[PDB]
Amino acid sequence: KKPQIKYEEKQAVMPESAAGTYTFEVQTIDGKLDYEPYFTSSTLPWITGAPTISSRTDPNKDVISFTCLKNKTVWNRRAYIKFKDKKTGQYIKGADGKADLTVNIIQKKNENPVVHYKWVDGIGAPTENQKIKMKIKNNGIETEDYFTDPFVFKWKETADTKFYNVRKLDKLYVQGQFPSNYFVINGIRNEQIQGRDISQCWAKTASNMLHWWFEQNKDYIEQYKQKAAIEEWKRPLYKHDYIRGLQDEDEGKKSNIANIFRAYSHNNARGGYIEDGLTWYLYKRDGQKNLGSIYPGLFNDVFAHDTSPINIERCETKKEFEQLMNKTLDNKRAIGIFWQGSKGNRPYQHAVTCWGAAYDEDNNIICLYIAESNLPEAVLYPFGVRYKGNIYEEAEKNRTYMFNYALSKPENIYIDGLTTLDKGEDQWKKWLEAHQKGE
Ligand SMILES: *[C@@H](C(=O)O)[C@H](O)C(=O)N[C@@H](CC(C)C)C(=O)NCCCCNC(N)=[NH2+]
């Protein structure tokens, strides 16, 4: 009788997050088969060495040992052990006699990660009094449990916060309760205009980024107003007013920039693009003609498409997403995100604004802080970052999925890329120097 080994593969081996040498048992039938265990990847950095048979003293079973590093991340991480017959060199067969015998190793996440944060330049950082914990909800009902990871917080807007989150009047509006004139805007010819925004996620994202940009360049823009030969109709557009502390019923009074998009741009049910709204506001490009009934193009002698402070990049792996986020965050740029996937049974594509990110001790990006013009509260919401494939030896694609803490469910929604808006310092400085050279 040939000895065999058996293992019930439905049982994962789940070591704790701490570093250590962990063990599981393999049943040895009719003797002690001469075999050697192997990880499916030998290069996984968080496993030190090969598995070994650490005890055979029990005639009925062997103990297998393997050694892990500490899992500092907030995600489980997987490895796989198979077994080779030391004589035939073949992999030993599992229970069905056709698949190789495989043991699933799942090292558990760190329950006490140390977290640090990076925020878009110039918006400050949340105080503890500005951070709001979130109730774990299930099927739509709060369980009165809360998400306990400390990076899971809403960043509440107050009189003192410096991010921007313009919200859709069409989402906030309650018919028969809100004022009948909720949607009215006083236009440029101080005419009365009623704008809707149910499909303007791209314009809300553009407006948030433009508020940040006008604030960061406020001194340059004051000089521009005084030195440039501004077109008469455009003069009132060289400011930004974002009024914090308003009620939902007063959202129409909150942002002059958002109101410009809502009054004069488009609300096509097909949507728009962040970068198109940004171009439309800042300089002339032929493609952005007919985006709306006016063309602000407010700084056309500062910027052109060749000197554009607007960039669009894509990401399909953890490495690419993280490279892009870090480059953007270390460079004084505002961040628009295009989300892509499925929400329910319908295709989903959405533009939101990102104001910062949380990192674990390995500098993995674990959560983003999002201005979400579709969500009701005047806060930034946390969106957790998750990966479906290995993050240590990455596949060709490993998309950056989003966890919706507000819906308290995972969704098949991921980040396709970023549209970023740079301060444009070199361009502004060159414009200013050219004026002083003419004086
Ligand atoms: C977002 C929203 O208001 O919820 C809105 O639907 C939207 O603009 N979504 C974007 C998502 C990213 C900006 C990619 C979108 O899908 N834009 C596609 C615009 C295509 C318009 N096509 C034509 N022919 N006009």
Automatic annotation (TrEMBL):
Q: Where is the signal peptide?
A: none
- Cysteine sulfenic acid (-SOH)-modified residues are C201
Q: Which residue windows are transmembrane per the record? A: none
Q: What GO MF annotations does this protein's record show?
A: peptidase activity
Q: What is this protein called?
A: Bacterial Ig-like domain protein
The record lists the organism as Treponema denticola (strain ATCC 35405 / DSM 14222 / CIP 103919 / JCM 8153 / KCTC 15104)
Q: Which residues of the full protein are shown?
A: 212 to 647 of 647
